[PDB]
Design a protein around this nucleic acid. Structure first.
Ligand code: D3T
Lengths: 138, 69, 69
DNA sequence: AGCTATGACCATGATTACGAATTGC
DNA sequence: ACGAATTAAGCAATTCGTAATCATGGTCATAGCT
């Protein structure tokens, strides 16, 4: 700021992040995909009208979260809600054919699914927060 | 006070740019007593008005001075 | 490759800046300060005027990566 | 009582300028 | 027209729709002659 106020050019990186990056490694970087934690997530909320992320006035009903280091899906289900209370979800029925009441979900994907149902939204959100702390995605 | 007819429209932007692209940035700032000159772009009346501000001297373009007074 | 944070890939400005800075530092040089300019439009590529009639036999040519070349 | 030339109209056709959505080098 | 603190790939091109404006065909109305 002082050099700008005097009016002389201040040479070098104004952003220190990549400056420290270059000073730290210098040589080329050898990486590994399996060591970097990449996570995917998907959200479903049941409500009378379209829920607004700017408000989030409706509860969250379906949580799914895939992690790459453990290549594992975590599924959170709420058994009861003000918009409707429902039973659990069975993996076997999902793998069945549509004509037989199934959902055609592949079995190999089902092999990597871990289920944790919760009765109320608060417990589900606590579990999601604590797993996020335990499993911090890159 | 540095004035002239339509000075902020042609004279200043032209002198500044020519000195910048012929002599360099350091020579261009020599005009400012405190070596501090800045360039802004105004998109009014088909834009293209690179109003130059020199810190230490006052630009008082005579065209608008006569227009409003 | 550019020794830059992950998100910066969404902006080519940052990745090109980082890689050029790395190349310059590797040879013990110094990059200039971010100056200041104004947005301008300059002429783009050229395209001919085809006669909208059926053309039986056509040959096609191109130059590999025109602008870097 | 009917054919027909012509004015009004009502919409129709046509041209221009501008905003917008989409390619493609 | 001075707000004043600040920020992130580019241009050339077609095609359609809308809004504004001028020229006009089909048809209706007037009417005039037979
Ligand atoms: C696509 C694209 C291209 N360009 C410029 C860059 C130079 C030319 C053609 O190079 P392209 O990469 O199209 O040629 P390429 O496909 O690499 O060459 P071939 O035609 O495969 O020989 O156009 C650009 O500015 N932005 C773009 O998004």
């Amino acid at each position: 700021k002082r050099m700008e106020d005097i009016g002389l050019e201040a040479l070098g990186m104004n952003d220190f992040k990549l400056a420290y990056i270059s000073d730290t490694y210098g040589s080329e970087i050898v990486y590994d995909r399996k060591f970097v934690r990449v996570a995917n997530c998907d959200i479903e909320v049941t409500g009378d009208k379209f829920p607004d992320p700017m408000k989030a006035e409706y509860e969250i009903d379906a949580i799914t979260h895939y992690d790459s280091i453990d290549d594992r899906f975590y599924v959170f289900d709420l058994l009861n809600s003000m918009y409707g209370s429902v039973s659990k979800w069975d993996a076997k029925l999902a793998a069945k054919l549509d004509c037989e009441g199934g959902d055609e979900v592949p079995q190999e994907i089902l092999d990597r699914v871990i289920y944790m149902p919760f009765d109320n939204e608060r417990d589900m959100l606590m579990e999601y927060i604590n797993l996020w702390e335990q499993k911090r995605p890159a | 006070i540095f004035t002239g007819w339509n000075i902020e429209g042609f004279a200043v932007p032209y002198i500044m740019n020519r000195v910048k692209m012929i002599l360099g940035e350091r020579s261009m700032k020599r005009f400012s007593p405190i070596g501090r000159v800045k360039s802004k772009l105004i998109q009014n009346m088909y834009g293209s008005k690179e109003i130059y501000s020199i810190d230490g001297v006052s630009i008082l373009d005579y065209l608008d001075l006569y227009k409003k007074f | 490759y550019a020794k830059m944070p992950f998100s910066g890939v969404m902006s080519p400005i940052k990745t090109w800046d980082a890689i050029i800075f790395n190349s310059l530092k590797g040879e013990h040089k110094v990059i200039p300060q971010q100056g200041s300019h104004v947005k301008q439009s300059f002429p783009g590529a050229f395209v001919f005027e085809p006669k909208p009639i059926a053309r039986r036999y056509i040959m096609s040519f191109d130059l590999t990566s025109l602008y870097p070349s």
